[PDB]
Design a protein around this ligand. Structure first.
Ligand SMILES: [Zn+2]
Lengths: 200, 131
């Protein structure tokens, strides 16, 4: 009975995300990683990897949710590239995401709690691996909202794979090899967690 | 029709060490909104005051979780339980055993996740716990 990992390639179609000085486009990185991650997850009999975006199109926040829900996702990984004004700002980052009426709320308010925790633990794990292949722009998991819209039920993390703004990291993020390494890392990150806390 | 104001008034759900405390830092922003109390596999979890059982379902993380309404939107929650001893709708008087502890969220050590919500908002429970 497999653990279902939604892989959400950030940005898409109409929206390219951030474009590097060398002209490589966030969206075409994120998806290229996400597919390598799907491959590494579907390889592992513990996991099934599924995509919220499966090509070059635009898809709303909502829609990436509705896909992961319609695929019964147990956990979600968004993949992005960071970009700063400060062109020498570099490094991977990981973000942890969010969302009788007094019971109605209470239950969401517990699930929020669990999600947020699993999230953080997974983030930790992931950074763990990321710092093996790059440096981290933030070595602790940063809490935040935006994406996930309102999934208190499905834990989520956002991986900033690097700064596509930085002429150096741009070149790595356009690198099949390094995208592979990022996939490998993000994978090992999950594997390590679910390994230790399987879906019981 | 209300827990009323904290005054060591209420029964201890279960007796034992306070393994984790209201407010305790968990990690990053996340900090506990209940207490984790130590107890033996299958110790009887008692309802802190008078009220009605409004929920008894199994929540990822928190194991099987009973919830008791006392009025106002004052309610008590009990998690990590292996088993409940009542069914939604039942009326429970303070002291009445409503669950049995497990590790069903504990993971690492037999325990009770006990939480109070007032205006459905999670508060520090301790000041209610009397005898
Ligand atoms: Zn982005």
């Amino acid at each position: 009975d497999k653990i279902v990992i939604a892989i959400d390639a950030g940005h898409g179609g109409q929206d390219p995300g951030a474009i590097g000085p060398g002209g490589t486009r966030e969206k075409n990185v994120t998806i290229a990683i996400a597919r390598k991650l799907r491959t590494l997850l579907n390889a592992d009999p513990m996991f099934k990897g599924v995509l919220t975006r499966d090509g070059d199109y635009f898809i709303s926040v909502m829609g990436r949710s509705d896909v992961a829900r319609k695929q019964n996702a147990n956990f979600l990984v968004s993949i992005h590239a960071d970009a700063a004004p400060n062109r020498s700002a570099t490094g991977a980052s990981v973000w942890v995401l969010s969302n009788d009426p007094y019971l109605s709320q209470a239950v969401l308010d517990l699930q929020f709690g669990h999600s947020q925790r699993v999230g953080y633990d997974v983030a930790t794990n992931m950074l763990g691996q990321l710092e093996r292949i790059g440096s981290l722009h933030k070595r602790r998991p940063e809490h935040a909202s935006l994406g996930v819209l309102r999934s208190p039920d499905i834990p989520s993390v956002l991986v900033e794979t690097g700064f596509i703004s930085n002429h150096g990291e741009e070149r790595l993020l356009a690198s099949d090899e390094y995208q592979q390494r990022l996939a490998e890392a993000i994978y090992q990150g999950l594997r390590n967690y679910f390994q230790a806390h399987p879906l019981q | 029709g209300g827990l009323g104001s904290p005054r060591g008034q209420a029964y201890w759900p279960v007796r034992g060490p306070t393994l984790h405390r209201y407010g305790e830092q968990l990690q990053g922003e996340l900090r506990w909104k209940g207490m984790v109390i130590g107890a033996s596999e299958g110790t009887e979890v008692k309802a802190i005051a008078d009220g009605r059982v409004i929920l008894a379902d199994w929540l990822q993380g928190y194991g099987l979780v009973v919830v008791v309404e006392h009025g106002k939107g004052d309610m008590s929650l009990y998690g990590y339980n292996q088993s409940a001893l009542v069914s939604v709708g039942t009326q429970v008087r303070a002291g009445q055993p409503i669950a049995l502890v497990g590790s069903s969220g504990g993971q690492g050590r037999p325990s009770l996740y006990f939480e109070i919500r007032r205006q459905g908002q999670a508060v520090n429970p301790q000041p209610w716990l009397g005898r």
